[PDB]
């Protein structure tokens, strides 16, 4: 296959390639995130140094 063979409405999402992306296909089916971000921390306390 080639990118031109994808129906246009399906070109608005992730297009996997078999067998290159099979691990990503498994992740998609498991509905898990491939990259997991750490929990958002607190905003940094602002330090003041006079002149």
């Amino acid at each position: 296959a080639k990118k031109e063979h994808v129906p246009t409405w399906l070109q608005n999402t992730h297009v996997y390639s078999w067998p290159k992306n099979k691990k990503n296909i498994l992740l998609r089916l498991l509905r898990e995130e491939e990259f997991v971000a750490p929990p958002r921390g607190p905003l940094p306390t602002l330090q003041v140094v006079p002149l």
Binding site: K22, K23, L27, L30, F35, V36
Partner: protein, 48 residues
């Protein structure tokens, strides 16, 4: 500033099982060979 050394982002990678353990198989019926002495229908006629 608080450095990210303790809360780094994490990548996930499944532990894929492989088809070597099992795989799809196709069934083939062994047609009763007619090269072997298999039967055949008989048409009966009358000598009147």
């Amino acid at each position: 500033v608080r450095e990210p050394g303790s809360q780094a982002c994490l990548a996930i990678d499944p532990l894929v099982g492989e088809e070597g353990g099992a795989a799809v198989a196709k069934l083939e019926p062994h047609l009763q060979p007619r090269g072997q002495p298999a039967p055949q229908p008989l048409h009966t006629l009358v000598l009147a």
